[PDB]
């Protein structure tokens, strides 16, 4: 039993990983699965930052 945030007592817990080239990811589930549709290729690596600002 959980308090209602945005009118929901259910929750979603999200996970991630970096799948390296030539490697495979394997899923198995009975239910409650939030499956990937789209994933992001990392094409350009370099200098960046997340800047907090209004």
């Amino acid at each position: 039993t959980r308090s209602k945030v945005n009118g929901q007592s259910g929750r979603m817990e999200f996970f991630w990983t970096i799948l390296k080239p030539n490697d495979a990811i394997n899923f198995e589930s009975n239910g409650n699965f939030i499956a990937p549709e789209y994933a992001y290729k990392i094409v350009k690596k370099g200098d960046s930052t997340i800047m907090k600002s209004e």
């Binding site: 930052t49 997340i50 800047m51 907090k52």
Partner: protein, 162 residues
């Protein structure tokens, strides 16, 4: 100042000497005027220039903060991160402010020194051919025309001649 010349036995500077930091004022029958001692002056300009660049360049490598975020149950390391970044900023702020204070004092004294040395340079040429008045000035026993004056500024003042 440490060397006693600037705002010391030389009471004040000269608005009328525009062309250099240190120099001479002459007064004889032909007239009077200011003349900058360029060499002493250029020496000072090279030293101060080097100083500024030395200061700027020494502060070149210095702490750069990066953004790092932490969840609600990572308060300890969040605090650590903050104390760490603030700590380095305070250290570099101290270094910068103290360097400026210390080197400002040395710059003012440096000028005082250059004046004292220019005064002694002239004193050591003239020796007992002039009265040391005690205010930066030397009153000649002989007439000293413009070529005579120039030889004082030269380093060429022929003492045995007078």
């Amino acid at each position: 100042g440490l060397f006693g010349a600037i705002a010391g036995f030389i009471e004040g500077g000269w608005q009328g000497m525009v062309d250099g930091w240190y120099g001479y004022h002459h007064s004889n029958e032909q007239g009077s005027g200011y003349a900058a001692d360029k060499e002493s002056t250029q020496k000072a300009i090279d030293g101060v220039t080097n100083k500024v660049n030395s200061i700027i360049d020494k502060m070149n490598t210095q702490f750069e903060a990066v953004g790092r975020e932490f969840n609600n149950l990572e308060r300890r390391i969040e605090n650590l991160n903050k104390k760490m970044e603030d700590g380095f900023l305070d250290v570099w702020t101290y270094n910068a402010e103290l360097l400026v204070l210390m080197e400002n004092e040395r710059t003012l004294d440096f000028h005082d020194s250059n004046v004292k040395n220019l005064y002694d340079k002239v004193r050591l040429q003239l020796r007992d051919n002039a009265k040391e008045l005690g205010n930066g000035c030397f009153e000649f026993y002989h007439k000293c025309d413009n070529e005579c004056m120039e030889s004082v500024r030269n380093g060429t003042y022929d003492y045995p001649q007078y």
